[PDB]
């Protein structure tokens, strides 16, 4: 009985860490996408600084 | 520059979670009649981390 109960404890611990990992993966991909968007916007602003020279 | 540090800390936490889940699955997969089954030296001890829930 106590071995089967430890089955249940290890399984629920595994599920908790797994879902931490899943939503942290969503956070990391979100940060990558937003970094790309802001770098593109900074590039566009910098290339608009060139158009003030003509 | 701020977002890169945020990304680095998130990546370190994600790596820790990944390999923690790997070693936890390995710990669950152990049962009786296995080659690794033996006696240990102070298995009950409280580790240095002891980071509660």
């Amino acid at each position: 009985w106590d071995e089967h109960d430890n089955r249940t404890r290890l399984a629920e611990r595994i599920d908790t860490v797994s879902r931490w990992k899943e939503m942290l993966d969503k956070c990391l991909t979100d940060l990558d996408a937003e970094i790309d968007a802001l770098a593109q916007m900074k590039e566009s602003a910098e290339q608009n600084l060139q158009a003030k020279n003509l | 520059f701020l977002l890169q540090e945020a990304r680095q800390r998130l990546n370190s936490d994600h790596r820790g979670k990944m390999e923690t889940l790997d070693i936890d699955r390995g710990c669950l997969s152990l049962n009786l009649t296995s080659p690794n089954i033996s006696l240990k030296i102070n298995p009950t001890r409280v580790p240095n981390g002891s980071t509660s829930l």
Binding site: - | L30, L32, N36, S38, P47
Partner: peptide, 18 residues
């Protein structure tokens, strides 16, 4: 058989120290 179960629990405790 009780000692085998004791050894199994012992390896479980030590495997989570890494």
């Amino acid at each position: 058989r009780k000692l085998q179960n004791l050894k199994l629990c012992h390896t479980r405790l030590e495997a989570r120290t890494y």
